[PDB]
């Protein structure tokens, strides 16, 4: 009966790039999800399969919290059945997803005058990701018949690109922080429960 460490995830000082999205597994704690739904600080809070307020009476063996930053125009891809550079090549939720997607504007932390270029996304990959896969490869993408042997050039493109967030960007181009909560149940040790 210790409380779940959501402050570690939502209020973490640093967030991951989407290609390397960070996930913390949270277990053996009590979670109150209604405080989040009424946080009013979140511009996206969409749940799939389960209900947000209704599941606060539920228990699971483990909940996973995946987190990352993308631009606002891409938050809609963090949902089942969507397509685009993020869903295809960076972070893909499954069709049978049971969980919640939570997002909020982070222009004031992750933008910098002249651009914050530390946040990257994967632009080139030969195949789409399967659900919940994480590709951190930086191999040069071979768009022609000639092997690249680690040297960038014609038909040989570095696979990650920077967002370059600037504070004067329009809302669709400003950074948004995202947390995906996944609800796991197996063999029922029941470690993460509601109040």
């Amino acid at each position: 009966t210790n409380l779940c460490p959501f402050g570690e995830v939502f209020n973490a000082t640093r967030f991951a790039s989407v290609y390397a999205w960070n996930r913390k597994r949270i277990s053996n704690c009590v979670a109150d999800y209604s405080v989040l739904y009424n946080s009013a600080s979140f511009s996206t809070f969409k749940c799939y399969g389960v209900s947000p307020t209704k599941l606060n009476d539920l228990c699971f063996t483990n909940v996973y919290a995946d987190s990352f930053v993308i631009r606002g125009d891409e938050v809609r891809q963090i949902a089942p059945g969507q397509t685009g550079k993020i869903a295809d090549y960076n972070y893909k939720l499954p069709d049978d997803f049971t969980g919640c997607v939570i997002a909020w504007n982070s222009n004031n932390l992750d933008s910098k005058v002249g651009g914050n270029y530390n946040y990257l996304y994967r632009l080139f990959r030969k195949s789409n990701l399967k659900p919940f896969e994480r590709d951190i490869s930086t191999e040069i993408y071979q768009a022609g018949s000639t092997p690249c042997n680690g040297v960038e050039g014609f038909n040989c493109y570095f696979p990650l690109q920077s967002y370059g967030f600037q504070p004067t960007n329009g809302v669709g181009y400003q950074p948004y922080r995202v947390v995906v909560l996944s609800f796991e149940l197996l063999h029922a040790p029941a470690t993460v429960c509601g109040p």
């Epitope: 632009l123 080139f124 022609g144 000639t146 014609f154 038909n155």
Partner: antibody, heavy 122, light 109 residues
Framework: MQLVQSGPEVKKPGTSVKVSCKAS????????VQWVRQARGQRLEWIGW????????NYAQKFQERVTITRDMSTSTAYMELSSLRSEDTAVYYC????????????????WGQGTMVTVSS | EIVLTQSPGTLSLSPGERATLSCRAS???????LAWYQQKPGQAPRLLIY???SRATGIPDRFSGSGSGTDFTLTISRVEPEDFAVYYC?????????FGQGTKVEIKR
């Protein structure tokens, strides 16, 4: 299939000029676009190039501070803009790209634009 | 900057003869990124050869190309009259992707 370019341009010294390359008949998203120029009766000269997918550019030092290569994938065209035009910049400007399918790209510049004549004189 | 010197400056051949143009580099260049182009006056270049060896789709069997290191050649086995034009070699392995001076293939009488 093809690459088509802007009209011809004549500009006074010190101004800018922006010519365009519209792609037709191949999956433009996955290719790259290189801009070169050629004085009348002289050799070809490499200006720069750009990666259609990522927008990253490389420029020869001759033009590092004066040329800007961009692309709009929505209309699937590329642009070369030369500012602070010198007299000696008058030439035909060609734009070239490798034709690409959904799966693979060509290992050389096979598609060439028709060229745009650009004359710089007071 | 990679310099590309072409030889000869201009060769003159009666139709049906053999043509051999050469491209030489100031230092070794990847053979995977070296190309030859045929340009006629007024027109834009046509890609003749890519990767120093491979023929561009739709270009006739007449044309061939070889070489590596610093020496590259383009060979026209039997120069049909359509083949009298300028030929430029371009490397594109190391930026800047420079060009040769071009050799002029004129017809001899």
């Amino acid at each position: 299939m093809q690459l088509v370019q802007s009209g011809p341009e004549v500009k006074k010294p010190g101004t800018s000029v922006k010519v365009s390359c519209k792609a037709s008949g191949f999956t433009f998203t996955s290719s790259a676009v290189q801009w070169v120029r050629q004085a009348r009766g002289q050799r070809l000269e490499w200006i720069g190039w750009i990666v259609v997918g990522s927008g990253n550019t490389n420029y020869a030092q001759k033009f590092q501070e004066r040329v800007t290569i961009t692309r709009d994938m929505s209309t699937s065209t590329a642009y070369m803009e030369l500012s602070s035009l010198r007299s000696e910049d008058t030439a035909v400007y060609y734009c070239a790209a490798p034709h690409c399918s959904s799966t693979i790209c060509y290992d050389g510049f096979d598609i060439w634009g028709q060229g745009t004549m650009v004359t710089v004189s007071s | 900057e990679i310099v590309l010197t072409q030889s000869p400056g201009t060769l003159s051949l009666s139709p049906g003869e053999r043509a051999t143009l050469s491209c030489r580099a100031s230092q070794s260049v990847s053979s995977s990124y070296l190309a030859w182009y045929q340009q006629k006056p007024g027109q834009a270049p046509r890609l003749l050869i890519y990767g120093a060896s491979s023929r561009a789709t739709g270009i006739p069997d007449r044309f061939s190309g070889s070489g590596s290191g610093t020496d590259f050649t383009l060979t026209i086995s039997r120069v049909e009259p359509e083949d009298f034009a300028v030929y430029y070699c371009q490397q594109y392995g190391s930026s800047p992707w420079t060009f040769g001076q071009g050799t002029k293939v004129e017809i001899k009488r």
